[PDB]
Design a protein around this ligand. Structure first.
Ligand SMILES: Cn1cnc(N)c2ncnc1-2
Ligand code: NA
Ligand SMILES: [Zn+2]
Length: 184
DNA sequence: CCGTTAGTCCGC
DNA sequence: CGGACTACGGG
């Protein structure tokens, strides 16, 4: 089975690639979880975060924004000691900030899913790249999404993070042409 | 440019 | 073994 260049031999990474990455996600809560996990990747490899994803789901209340938004300074200082996540105060606080930011949107008219999908025009763009070096790391759309998220109070959401989120949640489909998951 | 994680790599 | 190095926040 030929797969994208970034997939290691780790079966956890293989299942994530085959079953989740690039598959259009339209659920607001799932999208919220993914923008949070992409921010947790900053400066690190994605596999580090993926391997910890079950720990994140346990520590952050299955990414239910109401439960997250109720977390306090004491929770942050507790999580800073938890070796199952990334022990970085700014990143832990970012998940809490992001949950409050999502609530401020959703209690006030704006679907997070409608909002992120507004940065793509119709069907997800399918890459024409045969190799990872020909796939962009950010685009005009990811630039726009990052700027809009920051305006709305989100943290750890720059253009490169936003583009990786777009790939992951299938707002673009960046499976290389030779990958068995490419919609060839 | 400087600071940071977790993890890899490299030199002593 | 300890240090360098490695997409944000910062100055
Ligand atoms: C290589 N890769 C695969 N999947 C994700 N969700 C990523 N975020 C950053 N880098 C990523
Ligand atoms: Na759209
Ligand atoms: Zn692929």
């Amino acid at each position: 089975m030929q797969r994208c260049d970034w997939v290691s031999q780790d079966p956890l990474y293989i299942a994530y690639h085959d079953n989740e990455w690039g598959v259009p996600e339209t659920d607001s809560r799932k999208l919220f979880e993914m923008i949070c996990l992409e921010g947790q990747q900053a400066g690190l490899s994605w596999i580090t975060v993926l391997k910890k994803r079950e720990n994140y789901r346990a520590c952050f209340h299955q990414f239910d924004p109401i439960r997250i938004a109720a977390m306090q300074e004491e929770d942050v200082e507790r999580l800073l000691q938890n070796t199952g996540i990334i022990r970085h105060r700014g990143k832990i606080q970012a998940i809490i900030s992001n949950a409050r930011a999502w609530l401020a949107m959703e209690q006030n008219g704006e679907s997070f899913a409608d909002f992120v999908w507004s940065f793509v025009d119709g069907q997800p763009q399918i890459t024409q790249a045969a190799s990872l070096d020909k796939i962009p790391t950010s685009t005009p759309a990811s630039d726009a999404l990052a700027k809009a998220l920051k305006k709305r109070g989100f943290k750890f959401v720059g253009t490169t993070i936003c583009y990786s989120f777009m790939q992951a949640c299938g707002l673009v489909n960046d499976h290389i042409t030779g990958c068995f998951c490419h919609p060839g």
